[PDB]
Design an enzyme around this catalytic site. Structure first.
Site, PDB file in Angstrom:
ATOM      1  N   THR A 240     -25.052 -19.293  -9.733  1.00 20.64           N
ATOM      2  CA  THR A 240     -24.949 -20.741  -9.420  1.00 20.64           C
ATOM      3  C   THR A 240     -26.285 -21.418  -9.789  1.00 20.64           C
ATOM      4  O   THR A 240     -26.264 -22.473 -10.465  1.00 20.64           O
ATOM      5  CB  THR A 240     -24.612 -20.928  -7.937  1.00 20.64           C
ATOM      6  N   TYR A 241     -27.429 -20.795  -9.449  1.00 22.51           N
ATOM      7  CA  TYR A 241     -28.754 -21.469  -9.437  1.00 22.51           C
ATOM      8  C   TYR A 241     -29.691 -20.965 -10.552  1.00 22.51           C
ATOM      9  O   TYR A 241     -30.764 -21.590 -10.804  1.00 22.51           O
ATOM     10  CB  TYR A 241     -29.389 -21.305  -8.054  1.00 22.51           C
ATOM     11  N   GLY A 242     -29.305 -19.922 -11.254  1.00 24.65           N
ATOM     12  CA  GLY A 242     -30.227 -19.355 -12.253  1.00 24.65           C
ATOM     13  C   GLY A 242     -29.744 -18.005 -12.703  1.00 24.65           C
ATOM     14  O   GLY A 242     -28.720 -17.503 -12.229  1.00 24.65           O
TER      15      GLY A 242
ATOM     16  N   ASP B  97     -18.488  -6.530  -8.331  1.00 27.75           N
ATOM     17  CA  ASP B  97     -17.996  -7.648  -7.488  1.00 27.75           C
ATOM     18  C   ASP B  97     -16.465  -7.580  -7.365  1.00 27.75           C
ATOM     19  O   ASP B  97     -15.762  -6.867  -8.100  1.00 27.75           O
ATOM     20  CB  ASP B  97     -18.480  -9.016  -7.946  1.00 27.75           C
TER      21      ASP B  97
ATOM     22  N   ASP C 108     -19.860 -21.256   0.315  1.00 31.14           N
ATOM     23  CA  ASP C 108     -19.384 -21.105  -1.075  1.00 31.14           C
ATOM     24  C   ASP C 108     -18.915 -19.670  -1.299  1.00 31.14           C
ATOM     25  O   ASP C 108     -19.196 -19.067  -2.383  1.00 31.14           O
ATOM     26  CB  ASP C 108     -20.428 -21.537  -2.114  1.00 31.14           C
TER      27      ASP C 108
ATOM     28  N   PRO D 188     -14.739 -14.639  -4.872  1.00 31.59           N
ATOM     29  CA  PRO D 188     -14.729 -13.206  -5.212  1.00 31.59           C
ATOM     30  C   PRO D 188     -16.018 -12.745  -5.908  1.00 31.59           C
ATOM     31  O   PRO D 188     -16.449 -11.631  -5.661  1.00 31.59           O
ATOM     32  CB  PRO D 188     -13.476 -13.070  -6.087  1.00 31.59           C
TER      33      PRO D 188
ATOM     34  N   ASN E 245     -19.032 -13.459  -5.305  1.00 29.11           N
ATOM     35  CA  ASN E 245     -20.127 -13.212  -4.343  1.00 29.11           C
ATOM     36  C   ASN E 245     -19.755 -12.234  -3.255  1.00 29.11           C
ATOM     37  O   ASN E 245     -20.463 -12.122  -2.260  1.00 29.11           O
ATOM     38  CB  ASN E 245     -20.930 -14.427  -3.939  1.00 29.11           C
TER      39      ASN E 245
END
Ligand SMILES: Nc1cccc(N)n1
EC number: 2.7.11.22
Length: 293
Positions: free
Chosen positions: A16-18, A81, A122, A125, A127
């Protein structure tokens, strides 16, 4: 210069962030996941508190590094995952005993975090991480409250709406822990049926898919819903469908629990703690998944 503290660093994926790396800590030899957070002192103090939020069903946050105006999070590494595992199990499906074990474990992780007043916000699947021992763990818990949930990732990927609770979609400002029970119910359904429950592709498509399965909510099932910021009286009125049609061939124990996890009213929605006591988990076991690593 912080990457010299890792023996090797290879890209796993795009978070999501990087960027997410698999990396080997030089001093300890441990293999970790290393997440770059792209861009802030409030987020540092919130994230740092998550180093204490330790549970066997929560991916361990080992360290928070702030350097050169960049933030890196060092996590416990797991090899697979649930998204990949459900794709790989598509022909046969995940066996019910293993779905049950996974749901049980995930509820234990939520119950722990929720007891410490920490939300995920949030779940998806992607995560939920699994190991060879039959464990499943929640990744990235507490990060949404720190950084927000963006519309697009750092690489312009669309952040999925499929697991988002209706109160979020309808513009409620105050999240509760119920949002995570909603997401987990949607994931439960997807493990059983082998097809996302509500695969919306916009905020209104998400909302209308929920409505066309669970019924358009009203003041009878959800007191206060018609006063929500993004509620519109012009929403179409769809009837409620029977779970027997939505998640065959789940049993009446599973269908009952799923219905409680997908209550519209977040105050009615079952807690993680209460869900652990549901009769669905009377015969729970911990099977070994077959993993090809
Ligand atoms: N492999 C992996 C991917 C995301 C998070 C973690 N902890 N590990």
């Amino acid at each position: 210069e912080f990457m010299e503290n890792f023996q090797k660093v290879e890209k796993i994926g795009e978070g999501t962030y990087g960027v997410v790396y698999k990396a080997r800590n030089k001093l300890t030899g441990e293999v970790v996941a290393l997440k770059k957070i792209r861009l802030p002192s409030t987020a540092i103090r919130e994230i740092s508190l998550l180093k204490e939020l330790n549970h066997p069903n929560i991916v361990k946050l080992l360290d928070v590094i702030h350097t050169e105006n960049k933030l890196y999070l060092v996590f416990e590494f797991l090899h697979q995952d649930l998204k990949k595992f459900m794709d790989a199990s598509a022909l046969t499906g995940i066996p019910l005993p293993l779905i049950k074990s996974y749901l049980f474990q995930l509820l234990q992780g939520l119950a722990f975090c929720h007891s410490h007043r920490v939300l995920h916000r949030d779940l998806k699947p992607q995560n939920l991480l699994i190991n060879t021992e039959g464990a499943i763990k929640l990744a990235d818990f507490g990060l949404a409250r720190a950084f927000g949930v963006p519309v697009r990732t750092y690489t312009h990927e669309v952040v999925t709406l499929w697991y988002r609770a209706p109160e979020i979609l309808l513009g409620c400002k105050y999240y509760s822990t119920a949002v995570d029970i909603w997401s987990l119910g949607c994931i439960f359904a997807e493990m059983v049926t082998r097809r996302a429950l509500f695969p919306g592709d916009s905020e209104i498509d998400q909302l209308f898919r929920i409505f066309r399965t669970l019924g358009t909510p009203d003041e009878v099932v959800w007191p206060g819903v018609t006063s929500m910021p993004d509620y519109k009286p012009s929403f179409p009125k769809w009837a409620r469908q029977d779970f027997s049609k939505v998640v065959p061939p789940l049993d009446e124990d599973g269908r009952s629990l799923l219905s409680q996890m997908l209550h519209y009213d977040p105050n009615k929605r079952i807690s993680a703690k209460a869900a652990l006591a549901h009769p669905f988990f009377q015969d729970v076991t911990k099977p070994v998944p077959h993993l090809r690593l």
